[PDB]
Design a protein around this ligand. Sequence first.
Ligand SMILES: NS(=O)(=O)c1ccc(NS(=O)(=O)c2ccc(Br)cc2)cc1
Ligand SMILES: [Zn+2]
Length: 259
Amino acid sequence: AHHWGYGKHNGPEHWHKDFPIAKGERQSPVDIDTHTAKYDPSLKPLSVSYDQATSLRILNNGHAFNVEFDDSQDKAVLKGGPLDGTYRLIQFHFHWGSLDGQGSEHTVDKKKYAAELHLVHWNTKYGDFGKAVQQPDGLAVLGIFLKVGSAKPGLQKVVDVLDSIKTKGKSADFTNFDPRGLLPESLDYWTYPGSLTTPPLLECVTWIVLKEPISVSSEQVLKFRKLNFNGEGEPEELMVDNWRPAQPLKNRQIKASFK
Ligand SMILES: NS(=O)(=O)c1ccc(NS(=O)(=O)c2ccc(Br)cc2)cc1
Ligand SMILES: [Zn+2]
């Protein structure tokens, strides 16, 4: 929260001046070295229960767009995997590039994907999101890579509403959206302890990154790139390259759910 962003003058290399935890011990994203991630047979299958999810609204917040969910009841929850307890879906958003060769935050053996989807969940034992982010096990973020190829039919409703939220601070009703249509076939994953990838960079996230990317079309991601970072009536700055690069792994282990 302030004047941070993704420009030359306010981008990721500057964030540490207002948010010193930027240089902390469990920062995200990271590069996932697939040959050093260890298979952990003690990890449980992931439980994604989105049947009763209630989307409400879509918001251009000046950094990305968020699809927000009603999190006032146990609808839409993530459980299992590396997690203890129940985590409730609050929002999802994406990070993406100016070109198809960059845009993801996590990388896989240094490969950058065109974009990355983050489904954000908070641990119900802390009562609400604001309290959860103050805890080392407060959030679980499910990360899904996007590659450019075939269209993702379940993404199109999101793509088509973006015209109505071009600029920072615009929102639109966005009810009855089913986030199951954004998942890949397999729920095989890597997991590690990390942080929010934007300020305030709080070290409160269990990351769960799916191995299988989803495919989206070139036309779908091109529409992401028509969004604006700026507000209405301000100089147009295309919302592109809203990703933080990989951060040092430090004293962490990345675990794989699969052999
Ligand atoms: N990219 S990411 O790691 O999935 C991510 C997720 C949620 C946030 N939420 S937030 O920092 O914008 C935020 C923090 C506290 C409160 Br209260 C509300 C929003 C930031 C980054
Ligand atoms: Zn994110």
